[PDB]
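step 4 of 6: structure.
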Amino acid sequence: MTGAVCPGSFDPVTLGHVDIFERAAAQFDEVVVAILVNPAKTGMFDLDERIAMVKESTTHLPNLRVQVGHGLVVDFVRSCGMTAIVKGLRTGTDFEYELQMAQMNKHIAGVDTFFVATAPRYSFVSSSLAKEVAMLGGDVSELLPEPVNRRLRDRLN
Amino acid sequence: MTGAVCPGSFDPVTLGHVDIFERAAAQFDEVVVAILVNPAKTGMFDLDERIAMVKESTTHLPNLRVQVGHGLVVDFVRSCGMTAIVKGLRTGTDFEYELQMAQMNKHIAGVDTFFVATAPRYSFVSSSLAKEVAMLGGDVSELLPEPVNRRLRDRLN
Amino acid sequence: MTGAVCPGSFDPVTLGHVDIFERAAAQFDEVVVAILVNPAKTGMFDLDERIAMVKESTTHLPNLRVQVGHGLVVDFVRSCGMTAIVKGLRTGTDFEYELQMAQMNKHIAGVDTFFVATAPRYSFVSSSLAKEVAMLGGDVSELLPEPVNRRLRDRLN
Amino acid sequence: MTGAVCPGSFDPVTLGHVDIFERAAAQFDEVVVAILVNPAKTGMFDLDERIAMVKESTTHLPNLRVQVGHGLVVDFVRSCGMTAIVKGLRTGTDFEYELQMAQMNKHIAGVDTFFVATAPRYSFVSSSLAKEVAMLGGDVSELLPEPVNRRLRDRLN
Amino acid sequence: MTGAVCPGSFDPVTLGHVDIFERAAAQFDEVVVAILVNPAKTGMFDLDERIAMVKESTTHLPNLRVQVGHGLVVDFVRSCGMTAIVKGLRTGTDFEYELQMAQMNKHIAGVDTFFVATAPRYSFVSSSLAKEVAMLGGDVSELLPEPVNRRLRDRLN
Amino acid sequence: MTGAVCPGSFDPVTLGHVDIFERAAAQFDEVVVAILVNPAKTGMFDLDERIAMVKESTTHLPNLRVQVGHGLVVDFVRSCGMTAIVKGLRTGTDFEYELQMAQMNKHIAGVDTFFVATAPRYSFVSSSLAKEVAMLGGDVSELLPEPVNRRLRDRLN
């Protein structure tokens, strides 16, 4: 009956993301994780890998499903039969830009956006910083799900 | 099944508040508006009046109910059988303090807080500023529900 | 006697921009809209089109003129015989960077910068977001002047 | 023809304030400094003293006048025959609250608010902090006009 | 040779404070915790209790000492023979005000202020919020040192 | 015994940077300025020039040394035998991103980051803005050390 979409590029999914997925799943009947296609083909992990990593990291959430997103997030949301987006806040989130998009999204499609602060212990990880630190030899394994750590280790090896 | 609490002093409720109530009511099975008791007895409208104003302003939301809150918001939330708080963001919201409380609330009770930006047209009204402007002769009637405007006019007359 | 410059790339001009033009025109004897040349040739609309769109959108402001800007904004301002820049604030404005530039501009040329918040209804449109939403099929026509909507429709068709 | 109001409590006026007065005076035909009456009678300097200090500190600005303000700033502004307020930004300014008031002021009276960053050297002085530091023995004389320093010294002696 | 002062009211000291004390103690030869006297006599714990709680919570830091502060922080710092203040940042810190004071402190006494972010797990506790939550029955014992928890329990009992 | 690292690209070093170097040098036994290698080869000044400019600008600080940094800042810091990073704050600093990195750096290496506000007069210069203004003909010589001004003049001539 109720449903939320959690959109992002998830390249790769972090435990900050999983924290938000868990909170959405506890508060909405259904959650869809929408993985957005990388535009100018510039990510670390390809689409199939990103899907697998999210799936493997959310087996404990039976009301959550993973789908590839295309086009405007709001079009995806309304195609899911939902009218809510749930987005996490962390240290370094461009909140003003998130607010601009939220207001635009409301304006064009009537879709609401609910923001929720990620757990403090996961509040400083982002996909980009995690990748950059890992590529330079740093240990971010406590900030990422094990399905991601396995793949990250493989690529770096 | 799902439920959110919208806590505040609502002295008086504004159309910014009503906007948030509407969005919560559209996304959760049940919404409880929790009116917090004024501590050192310093408000404009007494408790009965604040309750009436919220009730009269939300007759179009059948899954919403109004209750007086006492003690920690999280205790109230869990007594409602819920684990979510929904709070609006407007211009002038002390967001950093809201974030601090959200993290504390999560820590002590496991209760999640979802923030949602109020509609732009209602983004600059707050109970305090509305009262201050009205007391000095300014017209804020477009920013408040008619049940509030009626009472505000009476008190000022 | 008094004069302000409103600089930007205006690719394309939005109703947020027009709101600021109107306020500048009401408060200064003369307003010059300075359209800055796109550096690495990467915009949607070419210079002639951007000029036309601003002109066509400001026919109701007889003390406003449109000019192409080159080089430092402050050099342009002082060449106009003015010493004031007027810039709008919206949701998503990089205000800290605007402040840095304002202080630098004051330092190098003695030119003052006055910031003014755009109307709430136009506070979430930006040229970039408007283009991105339009390219993906979203309706932003309420946020742009009709001379822009006409051209945007043509390019998308 | 053009005119701006610079409202505040000016208890006492600082060189940050004078910087803003100077910029307003350079960009508008007329400037009115509106000294707001202290509500619950809690300031350091009484109204006559605040007026004198502003007057004595602005003798070099012949298009500026000082007046006592009463009621809503916007009512004062429109009574001056103006529709613009000019406010300074410094370190510690509650900008979000200033923005809320600006949007409210626009809404109720159509009055525009222009914000301008104070000079870096005067960006950390405020009336409150200056008083608090002076009362505890600190030298803030470089941050205040000499007419204020004279009076501050007298009161502390 | 090197020395930093950590000033505050510490009513009571939290584990966020202790985190900052630890980092200061690791980076400076000597650290002085300066407990500021409560002005209008409005705290929860009296001076002797606040001193005891800080002392009892920092026995593992032999280069740290606790002293009562009086007057301007910068006067205290320079009386300690130091020229550095170390202050923690947490969620809800009024950073703009901290920056204003830092710039003022530099201006009047040449004293530098170094800010350091508290550990994420302790980033949402503040003395005020901890007291307010405890008074309303909430468990904040994981966020405060045991010497504080002992005293807090006693007062609440 | 105590030591801090001041990392950056310093392309070129500004007086804002030198201000921070001076404060670090006054508060720590040793300071290392770590010049990070430009990734995709895109700077104005090459590595040898950046080193020379920092050296020539810090001859008055005998406890400061300049080194080329490689890899994670925290790896460099710990290789210096230190556990502190000192970073300046100016107008336009992406503080939220600096905070994210600080928390990540603490997490992966136990290294503390101390932030210190640059002097107001140097608070609006950044390497990027200085270069952009200089390339367009503006005079930024008061914001940069003379060793930089000499080289900047040569390149522009």
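step 5 of 6: annotate
 - The two ends of chain B are 45 Å apart (CA to CA).
 - Chain B touches chain A through 24 residues (CB under 8 Å).
step 6 of 6: archive
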